[PDB]
């Protein structure tokens, strides 16, 4: 319900006509939710079996 | 009874020798009552499925 659906549509509703741009929104979200960098941590070596 | 009519009939009744002046004088205020702009308004389109 990010765009053309507040206002009107109730809580447990969702609008067919309106699902496209809805969804890329929703992806949009999604992919700036993870605008970052792979930090290196430090390291353990193993000693566990194989 | 716009014309004709004042004292001259009763309330109940219409003058039958004077219709052509009253009927005339109607059409002029129905004419009259039009002379407007026909503004614009807001246009929106509709999201429901109708």
Redesign the interface.
Same mark, same amino acid.
């Given at each position: 319900k990010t765009v *053309?659906s507040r206002g009107?549509i109730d809580n447990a509703q969702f609008?067919? *006509?309106?699902l496209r741009s809805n969804v890329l929104l929703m992806l949009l979200q999604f992919t700036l939710s993870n605008l970052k960098i792979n930090k290196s941590s430090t390291f353990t070596s193993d000693v566990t079996t194989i």
């Amino acid at each position: 319900k990010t765009v *053309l659906s507040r206002g009107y549509i109730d809580n447990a509703q969702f609008n067919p *006509l309106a699902l496209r741009s809805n969804v890329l929104l929703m992806l949009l979200q999604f992919t700036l939710s993870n605008l970052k960098i792979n930090k290196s941590s430090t390291f353990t070596s193993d000693v566990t079996t194989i």
